[PDB]
């Protein structure tokens, strides 16, 4: 369920959110009856957007960016509060990122990617690029996206997920392949088989850029490739990104 018309949430989408809750939760209407109109609810502090001293090393800045993303909370309400159109020009997506910092609602993985780009445009020596993972568990396919990053030749990731090992990686992996294989192993530990990886090109650091994010610059079919061809394909993506300069 996606809120397809800004904030405040309109009466129709608001009721649909509560209707949807009543389906999911075993005591779904007991939950609404206790929350809706309640006058004693916690005040939620608006998280402060982190700002960085120039003497602060970038990896320490990334920790603060990821902390801020987590503070918004993963969205378990069943209703997505921001519409993300993935082919929107970057400048429109950055307007959306800013709106997300001003409204401060829970988010999921794709919103966190956009936010990660917005909060690291101030770091021109940081390379940012989306990584999407398609996995398989119990006869079903699952998609997850993170923001891959590269600082001083080391690879890491920012993002949001239900699982702690499927989001933040400090920029410590020497190669892109090592980063991706770290995700594949984390998936295997929770019984998901990794089927595809889709890697985007690096994203411009200009928040007024009209260019689109290219999400699928490399699409890798994991088991059709085999391990050596899989690594070589990732090395090639790493070189392609090095040669696309943008800020």
């Amino acid at each position: 369920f996606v809120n397809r018309g800004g904030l405040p949430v309109d009466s129709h989408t608001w009721e649909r959110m509560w209707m949807h809750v009543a389906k999911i939760h075993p005591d779904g209407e007991k939950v609404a009856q206790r929350i809706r109109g309640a006058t004693d609810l916690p005040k939620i502090p608006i998280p402060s957007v982190p700002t960085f001293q120039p003497s602060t090393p970038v990896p320490e800045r990334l920790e603060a960016v990821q902390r801020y993303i987590r503070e918004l909370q993963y969205n378990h309400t069943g209703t997505q509060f921001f519409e993300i159109k993935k082919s929107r020009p970057l400048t429109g997506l950055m307007d959306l990122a800013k709106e997300m910092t001003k409204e401060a609602l829970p988010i999921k993985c794709l919103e966190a990617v956009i936010l990660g780009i917005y909060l690291t445009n101030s770091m021109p020596t940081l390379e940012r690029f989306p990584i999407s993972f398609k996995t398989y568990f119990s006869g079903n396919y699952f998609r997850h996206i993170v923001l891959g990053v590269n600082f001083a030749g080391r690879y890491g990731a920012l993002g949001m997920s239900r699982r702690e090992d499927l989001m933040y990686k400090p920029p410590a992996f020497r190669t892109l392949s090592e980063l991706v294989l770290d995700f594949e192993a984390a998936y295997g530990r929770c019984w998901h088989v990794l089927k595809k990886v889709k890697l985007g090109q690096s994203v411009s650091h200009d928040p007024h850029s009209v260019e689109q994010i290219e999400w699928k610059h490399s699409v890798l079919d994991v088991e059709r490739l085999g391990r050596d061809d899989f690594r070589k394909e990732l090395e090639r993506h790493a070189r392609d990104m090095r040669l696309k300069i943008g800020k």
Binding site: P8, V21, I35, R36, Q73, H76, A104, L105
Partner: peptide
Amino acid sequence: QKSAQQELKQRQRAEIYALNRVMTELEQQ
């Protein structure tokens, strides 16, 4: 004037986070 939109957003945001806590609690149990 426009302070009704703000109170609307404030009331909605508080219920959104209360709901998110309950749903988060459920979706691990």
